[PDB]
Amino acid sequence: FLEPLLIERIRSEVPGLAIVSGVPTLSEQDQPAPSAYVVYLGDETGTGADHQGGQRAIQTVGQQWAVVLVVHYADSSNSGEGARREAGPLLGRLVKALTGWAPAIDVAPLARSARQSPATYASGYLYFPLVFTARF
Amino acid sequence: FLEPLLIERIRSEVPGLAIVSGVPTLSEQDQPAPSAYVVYLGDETGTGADHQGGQRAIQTVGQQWAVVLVVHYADSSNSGEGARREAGPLLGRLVKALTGWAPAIDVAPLARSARQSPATYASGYLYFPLVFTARF
Amino acid sequence: FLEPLLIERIRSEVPGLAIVSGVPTLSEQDQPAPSAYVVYLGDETGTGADHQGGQRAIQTVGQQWAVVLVVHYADSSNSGEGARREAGPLLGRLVKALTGWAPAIDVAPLARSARQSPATYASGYLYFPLVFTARF
Amino acid sequence: FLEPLLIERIRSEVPGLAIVSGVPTLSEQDQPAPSAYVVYLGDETGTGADHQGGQRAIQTVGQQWAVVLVVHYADSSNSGEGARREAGPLLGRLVKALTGWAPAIDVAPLARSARQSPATYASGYLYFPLVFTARF
Amino acid sequence: FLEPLLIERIRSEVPGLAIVSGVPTLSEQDQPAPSAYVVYLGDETGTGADHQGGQRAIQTVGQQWAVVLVVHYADSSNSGEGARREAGPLLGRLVKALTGWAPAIDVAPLARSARQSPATYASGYLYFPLVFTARF
Amino acid sequence: FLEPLLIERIRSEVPGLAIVSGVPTLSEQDQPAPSAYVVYLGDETGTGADHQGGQRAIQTVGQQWAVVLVVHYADSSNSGEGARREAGPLLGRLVKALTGWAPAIDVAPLARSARQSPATYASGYLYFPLVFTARF
């Protein structure tokens, strides 16, 4: 219950052309700019372990959080050259800022996943079903 | 089955500009005032324990209850400065009045959660998936 | 399979102004009169116990049945004074007539719940998620 | 796989005024005649018992089948007098013809339920959630 | 992965009047001809047995497949005489051609069910919820 | 998280007449060309085994991926001659390129299924519910 203090800098208006898009199916044909395009998948819950405490019946609630990549630059049905090759550094930047960059945390792990996040394509332009953990 | 006696003062017409809004997705762009914006999540049920009694097959039914924060003041895609920093006292007020302030209760715990209620943002303005327990 | 014989008197046309309303979301703003406003929640089923018999594979089927309270008299966003305080006797009348007043019953318990039926408000006028058992 | 031979007489055009109604929510206000008004609930399945055989992986499949009663004669919001009191013989006729009257059956029990079939009212005119077994 | 070689003869344009109907609710009132009217129910899956192998994590997947009978000849709300009595040979033909007539099969059982396939009527003209297995 | 490097060549614009079709129900009557027509089925997940590791709570996530075949050439309600007989080599090409052709993979098995992928027809022209594994 303290993430906003760092979320403020986590979010930095990634797209320069998209304005008031309310970003978080994709168009892939008329998007003004390659915005972050965050997505939500689900949640993780469990008890009967170190997560659960005493009063208030709360536990360390597992949280899910994913993103969608929209570049379509150098990849317009030609080949996957420049779609993720350029994203690599961008993917690292996104995964390091939006996740893994947490405030002073005691019971808020803010789990981050640098690797082991497979993504498969479809629709003929670009799909990226990212899989990351939040834990908070 | 006695909460209304204190609910009467729990609710005190938080918004001064919103009238007959039937508050309990959000707009985040044309809301007249920062109302309480309460939300409902689910329920908790269980038997075979101290909750269950004899006749009437009733038990201490776990109840879920959450809220949504809508301020968008000092936080208009600029930064999370003034969104929750000002809410902190307001969040405490809300969580202490709407929850944890119960009448003479014998089997109505009215559980309250001051901490351990994480919230994540999205849509580019403000999201707050509050997680609180009611137990009644 | 004999409840109608007493249901006939259970139902007595509670509202004097509402006519052919087909009562069993609520409006809370243009309702002519405070009708009973019965609601249905679900069912309870189980076997491998005294409920199950021999032939016909039938058992004492648990039945769920609830009501909604619509008074909005002395409680019009002012305070919860007169909403349930006046309902108390009315709630007892409803729960004693509609439930617990059964015909000659051998395997039809017709369970009734005088207490332990919590209700929470929302929408800014009145909500009452009653929880009662029927067992038949 | 032989029921039609007796279904032919099971069905005998109960309503005299309803024509091509395709009977199997109810109106309760403009129905020409009190038709049978059969309804379907679900199915029952199980293996690892005498139901399952050898080849073809088939078993004695439990089947669910219910009916809806629509009389609204002598019961028009007045009282439950003549709604089920007259139905009693009619209910027996329906449950004995539509169910329990099976052809030469070896693995087709065609279970019938004379009693233990509770029904609850609602909507202000008449409801009858009949519960019967078919087993085939 | 070889069924088409025999499916080619399995399907033989059963209806002579229905053209480009895309057959696999029914009308029962304006159908030009009594087509096969195949239907799909679900699937059967399982592991940890002889079905599962080594690589490719595949197993002998249970497959469900059913049909709907539409004759309405000699059975037009009169009686079930000629609806299934004439279908009997037709039902055998359908169940022997569409199922049980498989190519050279090693791990494709193509299960067939001659008997033990109950069907119940409704809607006042004809219903036939056939239950057959495919296993492939 | 490296598949695109080979996906780039996996996808090679199979249809020559279909342009900007956004391929991944089918029409089967006005399709310009026999495109790949990939489909998605679901996912496979599991823990408590060699899949799960230490930090990041990730595991070798099972992935599902299937295709739909649309040829309708030499098979136009005549017979299944030329529908899959010609597809055989095409099916092998598709299953070898789109699957089983993976980059340098350490924890990305990219499972491929040459056989044991049954497909059943329906709708009167062509259906092919392919079943393949991706594991990544």
Numbering used by the authors:
A (entry chain A), B (entry chain A), C (entry chain A), D (entry chain A), E (entry chain A), F (entry chain A): 9 to 32, 36 to 147
Lines from the paper:
Bacteriophage Casadabanvirus JBD30, from the order Caudoviricetes, is a temperate phage that infects the bacterium Pseudomonas aeruginosa. The virion of bacteriophage JBD30 is composed of an icosahedral capsid, long flexible non-contractile tail, and a baseplate. Using its baseplate, JBD30 attaches to Pseudomonas aeruginosa via the bacterial type IV pilus, whose subsequent retraction brings the phage to the bacterial cell surface.
The stopper protein is composed of a four-stranded β-sheet and two α-helices connected by flexible loops. Each stopper protein (gp42) interacts with two adaptor proteins. The interactions between adaptor and stopper proteins are mainly electrostatic. Whereas the surface charge of the adaptor interface is positive, the interacting residues of the stopper protein are mostly negatively charged. Homologues of the stopper protein are found in the head-to-tail joining interface of the Rhodobacter capsulatus gene transfer agent, bacteriophage SPP1, and bacteriophage λ. Whereas the neck regions of bacteriophages SPP1 and λ are formed of three consecutive rings of adaptor, stopper, and tail-to-head joining proteins (gp15, gp16, gp17 for SPP1 and gpW, gpFII, gpU for phage λ), the neck of bacteriophage JBD30 has only adaptor and stopper proteins. The hexamer of stopper proteins provides an interface for tail attachment.
